[PDB]
Design a protein around this ligand. Structure first.
Ligand SMILES: O=C(O)CCC(=O)C(=O)O
Ligand SMILES: [Fe+2]
Ligand SMILES: [Zn+2]
Ligand SMILES: [Zn+2]
Length: 447
């Protein structure tokens, strides 16, 4: 009559969906939550000793630090091995570097002026800075809002993704434990939260994205209600990071444009323009094996340092390559959106993510799906303008044409196999491409 197999001090049966750690003394397994060990602490622990065993054997044996510049702080500090991203020395070095002020390129303006008419007329190809909050239609919680409040609304037991910035590695924590950590002024490690999307929490009630962002948003103007696919939520994000948190260079998923508002603290963006040259150097860099050892900002001609003060709102347009340094403990809200202003580049960025085989969960949920719905509606628009007297605006045409090129490419016999599952069973792929080709031919003719 063998006893049912249970583990941990809670004498519970094994659950494969829960993080556990092995005690080197008793050989049993323990739930991180039962013994107070976070998933990100596992890499620090050399040999784990559970509380009970610790009474006579002492605490766990931790790995010894010999670094300040390598992801694996155990490597000997002999001279070989370059400085890696997000480490203490890296940050020190990053803070000493000299960059061209982002003032040379970004546009600063009043919220009331930032409209779709303005964007269509002058384009949206450089970052836009909006010092004051007035006229953005951007509603956020009081500047006094604290992490304890984030916990109060969202929910203490919610599971979020944390980033051990000095290792550039991900793990998971409950929002409660993250707050406990953030609240302790003395943090033995730099942790950063950047993917806590709360549009489905009681905290959504408090935030309201910028009008321009909603006015432009693809999901907001083209994603149907009668959709079989699940509507994407990348509109409301809560960002919390302690000082010296770092995010290496990247291009937001799906070539989406984004908005950031620092409630309190100070974020520092390192902006790189989306030139063909740079976009190539980036795609190489983001795949090279020495990535973590090369500060990409050096592989290009100009890297702009944009300091975002608390109270300010920044807008980064499609394609821009950027890294972010957290000058000080900060909490900021932000969001991503796709729009017509730069249809071509968005597709360009999407094609690039596909080649870098960036993980599934690290992309934009249903990129192709939305692209279909858009092509569809734009067909009705371009057509309704023709049968109405006016000729479409240059950009929209340049864009619908790029989208046209894209849809045709996905249907291509040797390719339709992968882009197949992504088509909405609400659209006639071959049909849209035909009707779209003529309106394009028509427009191209009249002009
Ligand atoms: O949290 C940060 O310091 C930067 C986050 C960021 O740039 C992003 O999520 O795209
Ligand atoms: Fe970003
Ligand atoms: Zn033990
Ligand atoms: Zn347990």
């Amino acid at each position: 009559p063998p006893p049912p197999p249970v583990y941990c001090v809670c004498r519970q049966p094994y659950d494969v969906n829960r993080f556990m750690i092995e005690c080197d003394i008793c050989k049993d397994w323990f739930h991180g939550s039962c013994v107070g060990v976070e998933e990100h602490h596992a890499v620090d622990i050399d040999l784990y000793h559970c509380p009970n065993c610790a009474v006579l054997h002492g605490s766990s044996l931790m790995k010894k630090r010999r670094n300040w510049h390598r992801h694996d702080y155990t490597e000997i500090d002999d001279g070989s091995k370059p400085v890696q991203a997000g480490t203490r020395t890296f940050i020190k070095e990053l803070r000493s570097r000299v960059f061209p002020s982002a003032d040379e390129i970004i546009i600063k303006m009043h919220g009331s002026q930032l409209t779709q008419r303005y964007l269509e007329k002058h384009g949206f190809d450089v970052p836009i800075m909006v010092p004051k909050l007035d006229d953005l239609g951007l509603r956020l919680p009081s500047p006094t809002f604290s992490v304890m409040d984030v916990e109060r609304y969202v929910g203490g037991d919610k599971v979020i993704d944390v980033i051990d910035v000095a290792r550039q590695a991900d793990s998971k924590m409950t929002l409660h434990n993250y707050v406990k950590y953030f609240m302790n002024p003395n943090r033995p490690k730099v942790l950063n939260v950047i993917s806590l999307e709360f549009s489905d929490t009681k905290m959504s009630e408090l935030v309201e994205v910028p009008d321009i962002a909603k006015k432009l948003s693809w999901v907001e103007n083209y994603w149907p209600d009668d959709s079989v696919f699940p509507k994407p939520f990348v509109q409301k994000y809560c960002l919390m990071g302690v000082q010296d948190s770092y995010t290496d260079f990247h291009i937001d998923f799906g070539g989406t444009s984004v908005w950031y508002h620092v409630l309190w603290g100070e974020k520092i963006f390192y902006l790189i323009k989306p030139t063909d040259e740079n976009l190539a150097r980036y795609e190489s860099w983001s795949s090279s094996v020495t990535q973590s050892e090369v500060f990409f900002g050096d592989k290009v001609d100009k890297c702009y340092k944009c300091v975002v003060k608390q109270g300010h709102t920044l807008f980064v347009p499609t394609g821009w390559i950027h890294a972010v340094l957290t000058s000080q403990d900060c909490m900021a809200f932000g969001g991503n959106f796709l729009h017509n202003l730069n249809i071509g580049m968005q597709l360009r960025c999407y094609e690039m993510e596909k080649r870098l085989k960036t993980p599934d969960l690290f992309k934009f949920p249903f990129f192709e799906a939305i692209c279909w719905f858009v092509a569809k509606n734009l067909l009705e628009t371009l057509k309704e303008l023709r049968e109405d007297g006016f000729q479409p605006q240059t950009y929209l045409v340049q864009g619908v044409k790029a989208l046209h090129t894209a849809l045709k490419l996905w249907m291509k016999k040797e390719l339709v196999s992968e882009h197949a599952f992504e088509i909405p069973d609400n659209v006639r792929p071959g049909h849209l491409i035909k009707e779209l080709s003529k309106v394009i031919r028509a427009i191209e003719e009249e002009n």
